[PDB]
Write a protein that binds this ligand. Structure first.
Ligand code: FES
Lengths: 40, 115, 89, 156, 95, 159, 171, 84, 27
């Protein structure tokens, strides 16, 4: 749902597509070490 | 269908926001239907164009040979003109490229909300 | 912690704090004459509700409301700040 | 409007109701259009209907009213629906000499296109692709404005 | 074999259950499920249906705040649609 | 009667009722005024249990202190090692909540959890339907798994 | 919040009593609402196995209104299962025999075709007229607005409305 | 009347936007019932028929109360799972 | 037999999309 509206705004119709929510790393170490890049 | 469909008119240019001059160079095509239960000629053309998976973007040249191939499969594809707002990417910026749904390929991805 | 006679204990705390004993009131009622009656009883202190509890009977609701008040008295609210085990200090 | 008093009879022309001044839509040839009521009245709007109806519920002639045939059919249908719905208590039929109501229960109805007396029962409803449709409303009122997402279903 | 077939269908039922519960919770506050979802989408809210059910059950106060937020956007959305975009975007409609 | 006047009737008026929004200038003042009160609330720490919604993998997890979350895959992180979740869109308090647009600022919210166990899923039977199925046309999965324990949630009055 | 576990479970899982007025109201629209309330679909935590249905009380069923000619066109067909057991009765005839039968029949069909339907029917209370037992009223928690707005009759219209209403034409 | 929904039943919902504009602040303190809007607690203080009485009290079917055979009774799990 | 309101709309959308495909093949 909402694909039409998201396309209107220029975002991906599926939130799981191209976006900072999916593309950006999902976590980091509490020690501060950067998390390894996601294989996906 | 009349041949005027592929001969654009000024009204069509305004509707689709395409300039009659400086014709677009590259096509963006995605398969939107299955080739099952379709005749062999349709099946062969789809395989040649490489649109095996549906909803998969494919970049093609806007040349007469490619245009003829696209016309045969026109009903199974969606055609959009690729646009380079920032021009062709460089070797250093090749890693920062991103293709938008609007049909524009940006050469720099900053990961900042447009808002 | 085992607490008997919550209403008496609640009154005992209130008098120590010099607070008026709440006036019990029936906030909500449902299915009174059926075999499955639901009663909500609210403790009103100075005409202000301090705690409300659900009960099958008015007595049960009053007892439950008293229990809720006792938790509030001692800062044992369901939404209270969790204890922290992370602290290395 | 002439009323006869009665042997010698005397007829006097009496005061006739006047249309309120300043119509909302001047230049309207038909009274309904003059008030911008072409597609915004229903059988529930009894106040408008009563103006065009006899004291006992009969229809007034179109010529006297002067309204267009399209609204005449709409107004006539609306009054029939209201009458069959018992929405016109003051325009009930005149009992011939001294008759009285049958005293049997009167079923509550509305949106009645046809008289309940002359409608036969539908014994067989039908299967998936043989379902019988139930008429609701009248075709004369198709043009009325609809505030729903999809056009109203005449057949229920 | 019966278990194998149900695995694919099992996931679909869970989403259906979550959607059904959301509609009842939204209807409890007087808001239709489709209207609530659309307004949240207009606000760039990406909470999943499963989490939405939990919020109503365990955060009724938050759900009302979400209900108020969606209705306010709906009122702003209706005004924006009627305005046709000539009027400035509303405070809650600002991106 | 004014020109183009339609008397109210069943069809003259729409079923929906028009609404009037408050004037923007005062509306912003209320928006700012409310924020100031909340900013004091955050500074005073007038809250207890908090719930935060975090999106990990393809799942969104509503999270609270001491919560246990299982991820159906390996993570490459040693057990007992604290990790920071970076994707939080909502955090809630007893009397207030905060909503990301679409995500909260990293400065506002920091969430940390610890890895508990690395495990594999219980066996999962896969057998396709076919004529003359045979008994050996069956597969097991036991997809890898990992366990995470929520440790702390940190917020500051940085509105 | 902070309530004891057992009382908390009782309150959330409790069933409510609702009152419905059927005077000049379409039974089908009431049935759709009644089915929602009866099945327990009005609760945010509705589950198929939670048996969370609610009590529904319907009154003035004698005065229900059917749209169009449904009174004389709708036929209810039943078969006893014995030779010559086929019975077909029109809605008008059915109402004359029993005012409440029509309302009950519509609700029964609207309800899911499962074993739980009969239990829901037992929980349903239908009264031909405004009369209700006092104990039922005490059990009653809330009344529901009539689904259909009733059009006003000529007499029902206020005198002020008549003055406000214009005279379209002059005879 | 900034809130778009009635605030008189559950809580007072106050909606606000942060200065940066990328966050929405919601304040929801609960609302207590007025003393005037509540009532005070009430000051005044055979086998076949058995199934029927049981059915009537709980609005259940008679078939529910009938016993079951030994086969199903033994099958019942003795230890329902409960965590915490 | 008559057609669902969904089916009629779906073809209309696809036909319009194909019309856009035609124009971009016209240059
Ligand atoms: S309303 Fe204008 S023709 Fe009758």
């Amino acid at each position: 749902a909402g694909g039409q509206w998201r396309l209107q705004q220029g975002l991906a119709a599926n939130p799981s597509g191209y976006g900072p929510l999916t593309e950006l790393p999902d976590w980091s170490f509490a020690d501060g070490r950067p998390a390894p890049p996601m294989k996906g | 269908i009349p041949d005027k469909v592929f001969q654009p008119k000024p009204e069509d240019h305004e509707k689709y926001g395409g300039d009659p001059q400086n014709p677009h160079k590259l096509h963006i095509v995605t398969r939107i239907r299955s080739t099952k239960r379709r005749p062999y000629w349709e099946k062969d053309t789809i395989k040649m164009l490489g649109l095996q998976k549906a909803h998969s973007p494919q970049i093609h040249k806007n040349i007469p040979s490619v245009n003829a191939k696209l016309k045969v499969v026109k009903h199974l594809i969606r055609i959009q003109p690729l646009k380079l707002p920032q021009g062709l990417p460089t070797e250093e910026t090749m890693s920062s490229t991103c293709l938008k749904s609007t049909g524009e390929l940006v050469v720099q991805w900053h990961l900042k909300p447009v808002e | 912690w085992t607490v008997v006679n919550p209403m008496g204990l609640l009154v005992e705390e209130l008098k120590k704090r010099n607070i008026s004993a709440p006036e019990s009131r029936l906030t909500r009622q449902s299915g009174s004459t059926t075999a499955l009656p639901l009663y909500f009883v609210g403790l009103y202190c100075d005409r202000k509700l301090i705690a409300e509890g659900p009960g099958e009977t008015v007595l049960v609701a009053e007892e439950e409301a008293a229990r809720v008040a006792l938790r509030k008295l001692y800062g044992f609210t369901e939404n209270r700040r969790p204890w922290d085990y992370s602290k290395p200090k | 409007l002439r009323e006869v008093v009665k042997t010698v009879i005397e007829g006097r022309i009496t005061e006739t109701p006047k249309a309120t001044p300043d119509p909302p839509n001047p230049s309207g040839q038909c009274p309904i259009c003059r008030w911008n009521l072409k597609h915004k009245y229903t059988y529930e709007d009894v106040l408008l209907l009563s103006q065009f109806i006899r004291p006992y519920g009969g229809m007034l002639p179109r010529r006297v009213t002067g309204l267009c045939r399209e609204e005449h059919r709409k107004i006539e249908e609306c009054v029939k629906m209201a009458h069959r719905a018992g929405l016109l208590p003051n325009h009930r039929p005149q009992l011939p000499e001294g008759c009285l109501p049958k005293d049997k229960p009167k079923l509550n109805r509305y949106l009645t296109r046809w008289a309940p007396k002359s409608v036969k029962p539908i014994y067989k409803k039908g299967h998936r692709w043989n379902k019988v449709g139930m008429a609701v409303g009248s075709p004369l009122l198709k043009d009325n404005v609809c505030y729903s997402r999809r056009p109203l279903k005449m057949m229920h | 074999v019966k278990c194998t077939k149900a695995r694919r269908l099992k996931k679909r039922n869970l989403r259906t259950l979550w959607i059904n519960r959301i509609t009842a919770a939204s209807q409890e506050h007087g808001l239709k499920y489709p209207a609530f979802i659309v307004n949240l989408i207009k606000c760039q809210v990406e909470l999943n249906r499963k989490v939405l059910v939990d919020l109503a059950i365990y955060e009724p106060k938050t759900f009302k705040s979400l209900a108020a937020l969606a209705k306010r956007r709906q009122q702003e959305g209706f005004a924006a649609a009627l305005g046709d975009g000539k009027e400035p975007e509303g405070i809650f409609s600002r991106v | 009667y004014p020109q183009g006047y339609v008397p109210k009737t069943s069809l003259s008026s729409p079923p929906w009722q028009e609404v009037v929004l408050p004037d923007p200038v005062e509306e912003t003042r209320h928006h700012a005024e409310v924020v100031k009160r909340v900013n004091e609330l955050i500074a005073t720490g007038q809250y207890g249990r908090l719930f935060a919604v975090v999106h990990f993998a393809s799942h969104q997890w509503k999270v609270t202190a001491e919560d246990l979350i299982l991820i159906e895959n390996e993570l490459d992180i040693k057990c007992g090692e604290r990790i920071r979740l970076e994707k939080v869109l909502l955090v809630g308090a007893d009397n207030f909540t905060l909503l990301g647009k679409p995500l909260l600022r990293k400065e506002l919210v920091r969430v940390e959890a610890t890895v508990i166990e690395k495990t594999e899923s219980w066996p999962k039977i896969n057998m396709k339907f076919r004529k003359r199925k045979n008994f050996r046309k069956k597969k097991i999965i036991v997809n890898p798994q990992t366990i995470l324990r929520i440790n702390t949630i940190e917020i500051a009055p940085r509105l | 919040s902070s309530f004891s576990r057992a009382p908390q479970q009782w309150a959330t899982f409790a069933r409510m009593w609702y009152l419905l007025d059927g005077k000049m109201q379409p039974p089908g629209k009431l049935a759709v609402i009644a089915s929602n309330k009866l099945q327990g679909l009005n609760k945010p935590v509705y589950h198929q196995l939670s048996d969370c249905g609610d009590h529904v009380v319907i009154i003035n069923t004698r005065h229900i209104a059917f749209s169009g000619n449904k009174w004389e066109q709708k036929v209810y067909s039943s078969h006893t299962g014995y030779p010559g057991g086929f019975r077909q009765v029109t809605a008008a005839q059915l109402h004359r025999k029993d005012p409440v039968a029509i309302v009950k029949l519509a609700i029964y069909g609207m309800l899911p075709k499962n074993l739980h339907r009969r239990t829901m029917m037992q929980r349903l209370h239908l009264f031909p007229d405004e009369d209700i037992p006092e104990d039922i009223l005490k059990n009653l928690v809330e009344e529901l607005p009539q689904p259909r707005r009733v059009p006003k009759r000529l007499d029902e219209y206020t005198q002020e409305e008549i003055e406000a209403f214009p005279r379209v034409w002059t005879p | 009347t900034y809130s778009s929904l009635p605030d008189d039943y559950n809580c007072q919902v106050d909606l606000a936007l942060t200065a940066d504009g990328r966050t929405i602040v919601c304040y929801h303190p609960s609302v207590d019932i007025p003393y005037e809007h509540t009532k005070p607690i009430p000051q005044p203080d055979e086998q076949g028929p058995m199934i029927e009485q049981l059915s009537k009290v709980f609005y259940t079917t008679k078939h529910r109360w009938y016993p079951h055979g030994q086969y199903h009774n033994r099958r019942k799990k003795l230890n329902p799972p409960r965590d915490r | 037999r008559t057609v669902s309101f969904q089916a009629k709309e779906s073809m209309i959308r696809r036909l319009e999309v194909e019309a856009e495909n035609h124009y971009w093949l016209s240059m």
